[PDB]
Amino acid sequence: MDIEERINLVLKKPTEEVLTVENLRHLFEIGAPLQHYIGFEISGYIHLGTGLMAGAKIADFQKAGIKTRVFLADWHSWINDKLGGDLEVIQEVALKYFKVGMEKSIEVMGGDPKKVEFVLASEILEKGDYWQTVIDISKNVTLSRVMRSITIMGRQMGEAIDFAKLIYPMMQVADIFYQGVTIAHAGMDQRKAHVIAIEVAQKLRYHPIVHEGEKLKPVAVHHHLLLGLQEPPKWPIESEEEFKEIKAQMKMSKSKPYSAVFIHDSPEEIRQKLRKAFCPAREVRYNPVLDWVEYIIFREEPTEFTVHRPAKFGGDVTYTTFEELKRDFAEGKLHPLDLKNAVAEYLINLLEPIRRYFEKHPEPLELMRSV
Amino acid sequence: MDIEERINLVLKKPTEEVLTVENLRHLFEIGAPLQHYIGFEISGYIHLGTGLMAGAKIADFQKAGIKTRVFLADWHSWINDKLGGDLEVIQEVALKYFKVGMEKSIEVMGGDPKKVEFVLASEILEKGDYWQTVIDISKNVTLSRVMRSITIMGRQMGEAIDFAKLIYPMMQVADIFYQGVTIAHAGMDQRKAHVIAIEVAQKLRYHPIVHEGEKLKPVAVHHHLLLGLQEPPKWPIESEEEFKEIKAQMKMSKSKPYSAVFIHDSPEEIRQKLRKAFCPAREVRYNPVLDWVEYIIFREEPTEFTVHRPAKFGGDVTYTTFEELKRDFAEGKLHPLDLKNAVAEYLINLLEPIRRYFEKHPEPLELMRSV
Ligand SMILES: N[C@@H](Cc1ccc(O)cc1)C(=O)O
Numbered sequence: 001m002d003i004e005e006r007i008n009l010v011l012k013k014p015t016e017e018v019l020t021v022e023n024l025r026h027l028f029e030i031g032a033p034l035q036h037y038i039g040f041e042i043s044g045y046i047h048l049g050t051g052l053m054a055g056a057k058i059a060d061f062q063k064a065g066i067k068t069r070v071f072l073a074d075w076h077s078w079i080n081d082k083l084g085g086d087l088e089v090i091q092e093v094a095l096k097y098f099k100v101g102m103e104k105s106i107e108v109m110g111g112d113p114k115k116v117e118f119v120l121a122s123e124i125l126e127k128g129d130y131w132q133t134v135i136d137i138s139k140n141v142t143l144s145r146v147m148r149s150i151t152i153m154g155r156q157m158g159e160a161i162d163f164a165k166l167i168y169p170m171m172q173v174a175d176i177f178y179q180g181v182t183i184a185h186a187g188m189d190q191r192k193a194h195v196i197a198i199e200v201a202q203k204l205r206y207h208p209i210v211h212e213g214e215k216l217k218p219v220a221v222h223h224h225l226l227l228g229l230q231e232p233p234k235w236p237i238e239s240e241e242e243f244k245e246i247k248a249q250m251k252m253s254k255s256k257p258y259s260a261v262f263i264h265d266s267p268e269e270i271r272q273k274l275r276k277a278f279c280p281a282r283e284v285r286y287n288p289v290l291d292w293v294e295y296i297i298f299r300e301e302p303t304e305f306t307v308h309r310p311a312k313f314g315g316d317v318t319y320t321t322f323e324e325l326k327r328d329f330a331e332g333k334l335h336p337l338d339l340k341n342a343v344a345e346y347l348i349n350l351l352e353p354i355r356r357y358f359e360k361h362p363e364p365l366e367l368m369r370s371v
Numbered sequence: 372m373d374i375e376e377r378i379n380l381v382l383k384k385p386t387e388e389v390l391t392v393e394n395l396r397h398l399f400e401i402g403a404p405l406q407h408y409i410g411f412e413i414s415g416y417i418h419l420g421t422g423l424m425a426g427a428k429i430a431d432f433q434k435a436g437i438k439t440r441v442f443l444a445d446w447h448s449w450i451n452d453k454l455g456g457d458l459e460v461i462q463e464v465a466l467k468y469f470k471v472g473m474e475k476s477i478e479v480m481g482g483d484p485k486k487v488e489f490v491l492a493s494e495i496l497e498k499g500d501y502w503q504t505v506i507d508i509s510k511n512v513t514l515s516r517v518m519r520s521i522t523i524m525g526r527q528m529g530e531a532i533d534f535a536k537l538i539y540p541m542m543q544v545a546d547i548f549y550q551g552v553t554i555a556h557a558g559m560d561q562r563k564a565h566v567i568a569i570e571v572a573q574k575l576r577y578h579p580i581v582h583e584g585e586k587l588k589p590v591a592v593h594h595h596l597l598l599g600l601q602e603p604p605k606w607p608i609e610s611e612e613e614f615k616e617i618k619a620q621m622k623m624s625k626s627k628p629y630s631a632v633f634i635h636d637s638p639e640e641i642r643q644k645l646r647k648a649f650c651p652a653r654e655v656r657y658n659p660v661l662d663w664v665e666y667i668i669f670r671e672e673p674t675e676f677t678v679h680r681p682a683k684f685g686g687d688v689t690y691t692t693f694e695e696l697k698r699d700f701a702e703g704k705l706h707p708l709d710l711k712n713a714v715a716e717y718l719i720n721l722l723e724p725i726r727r728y729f730e731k732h733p734e735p736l737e738l739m740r741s742v
C-alpha cells in the first residue's frame with residue numbers, strides 16, 4: 001500500500017488530531033514497528049463513542065497495516081474508583097463484558113476483531129520492570145505537570161484527592177512504552193498523557209522505543225468525542241470558549257444513561273433516546289444529533305443516506321455528504337422529527353449484530369445488571 | 372525472657388520514641404511475629420549516627436528476640452538522586468561498601484551481624500504485587516499528606532519537584548507491609564512515614580499484617596539523631612522552637628565531612644574532628660560533644676568513663692552515669708579540652724575493629740573514593 005493511502009487511513013474521521021503527521025510519515029518510511037493500542041477504563045455499558053469511534057479507527061489502522069490492541073485498564077479503573085473500587089469485579093467485567101462488547105463494536109465498524117490484540121493491564125502491571133519504567137518516566141515529569149494531567153481520568157484536581165490517582169497518569173504513559181506502542185490512540189480528552197509521552201520518549205532508559213539505533217517518539221492519534229444527547233446547561237451558547245467548555249461537559253461519557261445510547265440498546269430504547277435528544281430545528285452550531293450524523297453516518301462520505309418522507313413533508317431525500325444534510329437542516333428543509341427517526345433506524349440497523357449477540361449470550365448483561 | 376525486660380530492650384537509648392509502648396506490649400503478649408527492619412539510602416560514608424545508633428538498636432532488638440533486617444534502599448536512592456542517580460553505582464556501593472560497613476557497626480555495638488538479614492530493596496521492588504500494595508496504600512493517603520512527608524528524604528516541597536520523589540514515601544510505607552514488618556525502626560526524621568503506616572495498617576487489602584484473625588499495626592521505634600560537630604548557624608539559640616529547628620538542621624546526616632565522624636576515620640582524623648568540635652564550656656543545652664557522650668559513651672549505664680588529667684587540672688575522674696558528667700561540665704569542673712580528648716580516644720578504641728577490617732580489605736574504600 002502506498003504511503004499516502006496509509007497516512008490517509010490514519011487521518012480520516014473520526015480522528016481529530018495527530019501528533020504529528022510528520023513523525024507518522026517518518027515511522028512509515030523507516031519501517032519502524034507499528035504497534036497500536038487504546039486503553040479503556042472498565043465501568044458501565046459501552047456507549048457509541050467508546051465503541052464506534054474507537055472501533056472505526058481500529059478498522060482503519062488494520063487496513064493501514066498497523067497491529068491493533070485494546071487495553072483493558074483494570075488497576076487504573078480500581079484506582080479511579082470504578083465499580084465500587086472492587087478490582088475483582090472490574091476484572092470480571094473487563095473479560096466477560098467489555099472485551100466482547102468491543103469486539104462486536106469493531107466488527108460493525110468494519111474491522112476484524114480476530115486480528116485485534118486484547119490485553120488486561122494487570123498482565124503487565126504485575127511485572128516489576130514495568131514499575132521501574134513508571135519511576136523512570138516519573139523522574140522526568142514534575143508533580144505540577146502530573147496534577148494538570150488528571151483530567152484524562154475525568155477528574156479535577158481537588159483538595160483531599162488520594163495519591164493513587166496521581167500515579168494513574170504516569171501509569172498511562174508507562175503503558176505506552178512498556179508495550180512498545182508507536183501508535184498511541186485515544187479519544188481527544190486523553191491527549192495530555194500523549195503529550196507527556198512524546199516529550200519524555202527520548203529520555204527513557206528502560207523502555208524507550210528503539211529502531212535502527214534511534215529512540216522514537218510514539219505517534220498520537222486522537223478521535224472525536226461524540227456528544228451526549230441532553231440539552232446543554234445554557235442557551236444560547238455565547239462564545240467560542242463557552243462552546244468548547246460546554247462540549248467538554250456534554251461529551252457522552254459524562255451523560256446520564258437516558259442521554260447516552262449503548263451499543264446493545266433495544267430498538268425502542270434507541271427511538272426513545274433519539275426522540276428526546278436535543279435537536280432544535282435549523283440549529284447547526286450545537287446539535288448532538290448532527291454530531292452523530294456527521295461522525296457515524298457520514299464516517300465515509302462517499303455514501304448515501306436517505307430520509308423517507310411523504311410528499312407533503314418534502315418527499316424522500318438522499319444525502320451523499322454531511323454538508324448537504326447540514327445545509328438542508330439549517331435551511332429548514334429537513335425537520336428534526338424526520339432526522340431523528342432516520343438516525344434511530346440507521347443505528348438500529350448498524351447495531352443489530354451487537355444486540356443479537358448479547359441476546360444469544362445473556363451472561364454478560366446479567367453480570368452488568370448484578371453490578 | 373520476661374516481657375518487661377523485652378520492652379526495656381526496645382525502649383533503651385538511643386531509642387527516643389516508640390509508637391506505641393502499649394501496642395508493643397500487645398504484640399509481645401499475643402505472640403505476634405517480630406520482624407524488624409531499618410532502611411537506608413545509599414549515598415556516602417557511614418557516619419556514627421547511621422552505624423552506631425542503628426547498630427545499637429539492632430543489637431538490642433536481637434536480644435529481645437526480634438528478627439532484625441537492614442534494608443538497602445537502592446531505587447529509593449536512585450529516585451532521590453544519590454550518587455548522581457546512577458542506580459548501577461548505587462547497587463554496587465550498597466553491596467560492596469554499605470552492607471559490610473553496617474555489619475561491622477552492628478558488631479562493635481554488640482550485635483551479631485550474622486543474624487541480621489540484609490535485603491537489597493530491588494529484591495522486592497522487582498515484584499509487581501509489591502507495587503499493587505504501593506497503589507493500595509496510596510488510595511488511603513492524600514496527595515497533600517504525601518507532600519508533607521517529603522522531609523523524610525531530606526527535602527522540602529519544591530515548585531518543580533519531579534513526580535518520582537512523591538512516590539518515594541509511599542514506597543517506604545509499602546516496604547513495611549510487604550516484608551511483614553512489625554518493628555519499624557528508623558531515626559526520628561523518618562517518623563512521618565511510620566505515622567502513615569500505622570494509620571493505614573488495618574485498611575490494607577493485599578499486605579496487611581494478620582495475626583490470629585486480626586490486622587495489626589506495626590510498632591514504630593525511633594532512635595535519637597546524633598548532632599554534627601559543627602557550631603550552629605546562630606548563637607546563642609533563643610526560643611525552644613528554634614532549638615528544635617536548628618537541631619534538625621545540624622544533625623550529622625546534613626554535615627560536611629569535616630564535621631561528621633565516619634566509622635572508619637583514622638585515629639588522627641578523629642582527634643582532629645573532636646578537637647574542632649563545638650563544645651562551649653558549661654553549655655549543656657546545645658552541645659554536640661555532650662550529645663555524643665550521652666548516646667554513645669553512656670549508651671548503657673552505669674558504666675565507667677574516665678577523663679585523665681594531671682592534678683593541677685583536677686586529676687583523673689571516672690564517671691558512671693551521664694548525669695554526673697553533665698553536672699561536672701555544667702559546673703565548670705570538667706573542661707571541653709579534657710572532655711574532647713577523652714571522647715576522641717574512646718571513639719578511636721571503639722572503632723578499631725572497623726578500621727582493621729577496612730585496612731585488610733581495601734576494596735570497599737577504594738570503590739568509595741572512585742564514586
Ligand atoms: N485514561 C483512559 C483509560 C486508559 C488507561 C490506561 C491507559 O494506558 C490508556 C487509557 C480513559 O479514562 O478512558
Ligand SMILES: N[C@@H](Cc1ccc(O)cc1)C(=O)O
Pocket residue numbers: 409410411412442444447523524525542543544546547561
Ligand atoms: N528514607 C530513609 C531510607 C529508607 C528507604 C526506604 C525504607 O523502606 C526505609 C528507609 C532515609 O532517608 O534514610
